[PDB]
Amino acid sequence: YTKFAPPGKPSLGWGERTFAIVEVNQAATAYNQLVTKRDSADVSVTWNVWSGDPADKARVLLNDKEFWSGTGGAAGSASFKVKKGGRYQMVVELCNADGCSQSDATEIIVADTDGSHLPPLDYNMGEKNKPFKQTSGKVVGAYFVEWGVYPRKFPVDRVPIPNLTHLLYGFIPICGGDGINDSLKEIEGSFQALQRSCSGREDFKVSIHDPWAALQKPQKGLSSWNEPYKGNFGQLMMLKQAKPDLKILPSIGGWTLADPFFFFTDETKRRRFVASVKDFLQTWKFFDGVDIDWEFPGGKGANPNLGSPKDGEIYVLLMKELREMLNELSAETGRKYELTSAISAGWDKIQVVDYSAAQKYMDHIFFMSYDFKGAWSNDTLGHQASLYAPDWNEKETYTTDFGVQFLLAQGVSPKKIVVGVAMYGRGWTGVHGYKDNNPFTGNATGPVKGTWQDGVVDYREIATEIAQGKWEYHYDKVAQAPYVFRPATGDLITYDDARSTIEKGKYVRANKLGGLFAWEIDADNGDILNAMNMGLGNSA
Numbered sequence: 001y002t003k004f005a006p007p008g009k010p011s012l013g014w015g016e017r018t019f020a021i022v023e024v025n026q027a028a029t030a031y032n033q034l035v036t037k038r039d040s041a042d043v044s045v046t047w048n049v050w051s052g053d054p055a056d057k058a059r060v061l062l063n064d065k066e067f068w069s070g071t072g073g074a075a076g077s078a079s080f081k082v083k084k085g086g087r088y089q090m091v092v093e094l095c096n097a098d099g100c101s102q103s104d105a106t107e108i109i110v111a112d113t114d115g116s117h118l119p120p121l122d123y124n125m126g127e128k129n130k131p132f133k134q135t136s137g138k139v140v141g142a143y144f145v146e147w148g149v150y151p152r153k154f155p156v157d158r159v160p161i162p163n164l165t166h167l168l169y170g171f172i173p174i175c176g177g178d179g180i181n182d183s184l185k186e187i188e189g190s191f192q193a194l195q196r197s198c199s200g201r202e203d204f205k206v207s208i209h210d211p212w213a214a215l216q217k218p219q220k221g222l223s224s225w226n227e228p229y230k231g232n233f234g235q236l237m238m239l240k241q242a243k244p245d246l247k248i249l250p251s252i253g254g255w256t257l258a259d260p261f262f263f264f265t266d267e268t269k270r271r272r273f274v275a276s277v278k279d280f281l282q283t284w285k286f287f288d289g290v291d292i293d294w295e296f297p298g299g300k301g302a303n304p305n306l307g308s309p310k311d312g313e314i315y316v317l318l319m320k321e322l323r324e325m326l327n328e329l330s331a332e333t334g335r336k337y338e339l340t341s342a343i344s345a346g347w348d349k350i351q352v353v354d355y356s357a358a359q360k361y362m363d364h365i366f367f368m369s370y371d372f373k374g375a376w377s378n379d380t381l382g383h384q385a386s387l388y389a390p391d392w393n394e395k396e397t398y399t400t401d402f403g404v405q406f407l408l409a410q411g412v413s414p415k416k417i418v419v420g421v422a423m424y425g426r427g428w429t430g431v432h433g434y435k436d437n438n439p440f441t442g443n444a445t446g447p448v449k450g451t452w453q454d455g456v457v458d459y460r461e462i463a464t465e466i467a468q469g470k471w472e473y474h475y476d477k478v479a480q481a482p483y484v485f486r487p488a489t490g491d492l493i494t495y496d497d498a499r500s501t502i503e504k505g506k507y508v509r510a511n512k513l514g515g516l517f518a519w520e521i522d523a524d525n526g527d528i529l530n531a532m533n534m535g536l537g538n539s540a
C-alpha cells in the first residue's frame with residue numbers, strides 16, 4: 001500500500017498542430033511577401049482537468065523533454081518557442097505534492113527548411129541510370145534547372161541522387177530592373193517574372209525567379225494544401241534527409257542573370273548582395289553554400305555592353321567576402337559551407353581573373369568546358385566540348401585540355417578544377433560545301449531543330465534518334481568527341497557521349513583533377529552520368 005494521489009489526467013484541447021519556423025505564403029508572388037524567416041516557431045497548447053487543483057504545477061514536454069513550465073492545475077494554457085524543426089510528441093504534465101499526471105501524447109509538426117519535419121526523398125532509378133557508390137573522392141556534380149518541372153517534367157525526385165556528390169540549383173536571380181537585368185529580356189516572360197518576384201525588394205539582393213516552381217507547386221509527397229514547403233525547395237529538403245552528404249548548392253547568375261555582377265565595383269552593392277546571401281542561406285537551410293556563376297568577368301557574356309578588366313579584382317573580392325560571410329555563418333550554425341563557381345573554359349576569359357588569388361576561398365571551380373561552338377555562328381563549326389583539338393585544326397584553343405592547362409598555368413590547384421560534361425548537343429542545319437568528307441569544314445544555313453530551343457538537343461533525344469537510325473554517328477578519336485550528321489539535310493550535332501565522358505574522367509584522374517559536372521541533369525537518359533561515375537572510378 002502507498003500514499004499516491006497524483007492529479008487527474010489532463011485532456012488536451014483541439015488546436016493547431018502544424019507550425020513553421022520559416023513561414024511561407026502559398027499564395028504570394030513577390031519574395032518579400034513569400035517567405036518570413038524567424039529563429040523559432042510559437043507552439044501553443046491548452047489542457048483541461050475537470051475539478052483539478054489550480055495550484056498544481058504544469059509542464060509541456062516535447063519528446064519527453066521540457067519546453068514550458070508554469071502553473072495551471074484545472075484548465076490551463078501555454079505558449080512557448082521551438083527552435084529546431086521536427087515531428088514532436090506533445091504531452092502536458094500536471095504535478096502536486098504526491099506525483100505527476102501525463103496527457104495523452106498529440107503529434108505536432110514544426111516545419112523548418114532543413115527538412116527536419118519531412119521524410120527522406122523517395123526515389124527509384126529510372127531509364128538507363130545504374131546505381132553507384134561515391135568512393136572515388138571526386139566531385140560528381142550536375143545542374144538542376146528550376147524551370148525543368150514544366151514541359152520537361154523533371155522534378156527533383158527524378159534526380160539519380162546516389163550518383164551525385166553535388167547538385168547545383170539553377171538559377172537564383174539577383175534583383176534588378178532595366179539596366180540591371182537586361183539579358184533576361186531575351187527570354188520571353190523572364191524579365192517580367194523577376195520584376196514580380198522582386199516587387200518592393202532592394203536591387204542587388206538575391207531572390208527567387210519563379211516562386212511557384214520553387215515553393216508552391218505540388219510535387220510527389222508534398223501535395224497537401226497546408227504543406228509549408230512544396231515545389232523544388234521542399235523536394236530538395238527531402239533530398240537532404242535522404243542523402244545528408246550530398247551538397248546542394250544554389251547557383252546565382254548564369255547566362256541571362258549575370259548582368260548585376262558587373263555593378264559590384266561598388267562595394268555598397270557588393271555588401272548588400274553578400275548580406276542577402278547570408279539571409280538566404282539562413283532562410284533555406286538545405287543549401288550547403290554558394291555557387292557563383294558570373295558569365296563573365298570582363299564581359300563577352302549575354303550583355304555586349306557590360307565588362308571591364310577590373311572585373312577580375314571584383315571577382316576575387318567577392319569570393320573573399322563570401323567566404324568571410326560563410327565563416328561567420330559557420331560560427332552560428334556550426335556547419336561547414338562550400339564556395340564554388342562556374343567559370344568560362346576559354347583562355348580569353350580565364351586571363352581576366354587571377355584565380356590563384358581567388359582559389360583560397362573556394363572549394364571547387366566548375367570548369368565550363370562546353371559551349372565552345374554552336375549555332376550562334378554559321379561559319380565556325382567545330383566540337384562543342386571536346387577534350388583535345390581535332391586533326392583539321394590542331395591549333396584550336398577552345399578545348400577542355402587547352403583551357404584546363406591554361407588555368408593550371410595560373411597556379412590553380414588541380415583538385416579544385418571540375419571538368420564540364422554536356423548532357424546536350426549543339427547543332428546546325430544545312431551544312432554544305434565541306435571537303436574531305438568532314439562536315440565541320442563547311443558552313444551552316446541555321447540552327448538544327450532542337451528539343452526546347454533552337455540549336456540545342458537533349459542527349460536523351462540524340463540517343464533515341466541514333467537507335468532509330470536517324471543519324472550517322474561519328475566519333476573523332478583525336479579530339480575525343482562524338483557527333484551525328486545527316487548528309488541529305490546537312491544536320492550536324494556536337495555533343496558528349498558515354499565515350500567522350502569516360503575519356504574526360506580519364507583525363508581528370510590522370511591530371512589529379514577535382515572531378516566532373518554536367519549541364520543539365522534533365523537532358524540525360526542515364527548514359528552520361530553513368531559514364532561520369534565510371535570515368536571517375538566510382539563503384540557499381
Ligand SMILES: COC(=O)c1[nH]cc(-c2c[nH]c3cc(Cl)c(Cl)cc23)c1-c1c[nH]c2ccc(Cl)cc12
Nearest residue numbers: 254255344345346347349368369370371372376398
Ligand atoms: C548553356 O547556358 C549558357 O548560356 C552557357 N553556359 C555555359 C556556357 C559556356 C561554357 N563554357 C564556355 C566557354 C566559353 Cl570560352 C564561353 Cl564564351 C562560354 C562557355 C554558355 C554559353 C556561352 N555562349 C552561349 C551562347 C548561347 C547559349 Cl544558349 C549559351 C552560351
Ligand SMILES: *[C@@H]1O[C@H](CO)[C@@H](O[C@@H]2O[C@H](CO)[C@@H](O)[C@H](O)[C@H]2NC(C)=O)[C@H](O)[C@H]1NC(C)=O
Nearest residue numbers: 374375376377378379429430443444445446447
Ligand atoms: C545563318 O545563315 C542564314 C542564311 O543562310 C541567315 O539567315 C538569314 O538572315 C536573316 C536572319 O533572320 C534573314 O532575314 C534571312 O531571311 C535569312 N535567310 C534564311 C536563313 O532564311 C542566318 O541569319 C545565319 N545565322 C547567323 C547567326 O549568322
Ligand SMILES: *[C@@H]1O[C@H](CO)[C@@H](O)[C@H](O)[C@H]1NC(C)=O
Nearest residue numbers: 378379432433434441442443
Ligand atoms: C563560310 O563562310 C566564310 C565566311 O568568311 C567563308 O570564308 C567560307 O569559305 C564559307 N564556307 C564555304 C564552304 O563556302
